[PDB]
Write a protein that binds this ligand. Structure first.
Ligand SMILES: Cc1cccc(C(=O)O)n1
Ligand SMILES: Cc1cccc(C(=O)O)n1
Ligand SMILES: Cc1cccc(C(=O)O)n1
Ligand SMILES: Cc1cccc(C(=O)O)n1
Length: 147
């Protein structure tokens, strides 16, 4: 029926159908369109107190709870989707990953290199698509597939 990971869902507010991807946590009203050896992705990471390393270039000691990290992520997604902010600007300003200095770009990678939930989301995105919140041991990510 639908591309990998996508399912139909029912909006509680409006009652209209939408589409949710249980691999990427993406959600959208539009029916999703239409696997490579490698993909290229950028990401925005928000770490929390249960991250494998609760430290980053932004903050020597990261103390926010995982729930607080998810709220931050949800807010960044909202601003990206509304166009108030662009992904690259938010990643450069707020990603707890050292890749923030590269607008969140991680370059290209294969399966078997990244943390599995991050890998699976990256490979389930199509070029140009953005994930919803993706949880790994590093924290919570927003992933943008660029190639
Ligand atoms: C406007 C919008 C937002 C998210 C996905 C799509 C699409 O896949 O067509 N379109
Ligand atoms: C750049 C930086 C600073 C402090 C911790 C970390 C990390 O462990 O990810 N990275
Ligand atoms: C990521 C998240 C979101 C909401 C609650 C919690 C928690 O109870 O730890 N965690
Ligand atoms: C994964 C990545 C991308 C760009 C810069 C860095 C770093 O300076 O550590 N790391």
């Amino acid at each position: 029926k639908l591309p990998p990971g996508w399912e139909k869902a029912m909006s509680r507010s409006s009652g209209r159908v939408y589409y949710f991807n249980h691999i990427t946590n993406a959600s959208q009203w539009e029916r999703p369109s239409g696997e490579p050896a490698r993909v290229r992705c950028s990401h925005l990471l928000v770490k929390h107190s249960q991250s494998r390393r609760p430290s980053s270039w932004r903050q020597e000691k990261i103390t926010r709870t995982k729930e607080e990290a998810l709220e931050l992520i949800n807010g960044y997604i909202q601003k990206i989707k509304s166009g108030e902010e662009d992904f690259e600007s938010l990643a450069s300003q707020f990603s707890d990953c050292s890749s923030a200095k590269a607008r969140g770009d991680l370059g290209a990678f294969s399966r078997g290199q990244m943390q599995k939930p991050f890998e699976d989301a990256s490979f389930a995105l199509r070029t140009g698509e953005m994930s919803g919140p993706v949880f790994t041991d590093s924290g919570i990510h927003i992933i943008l597939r660029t190639e």
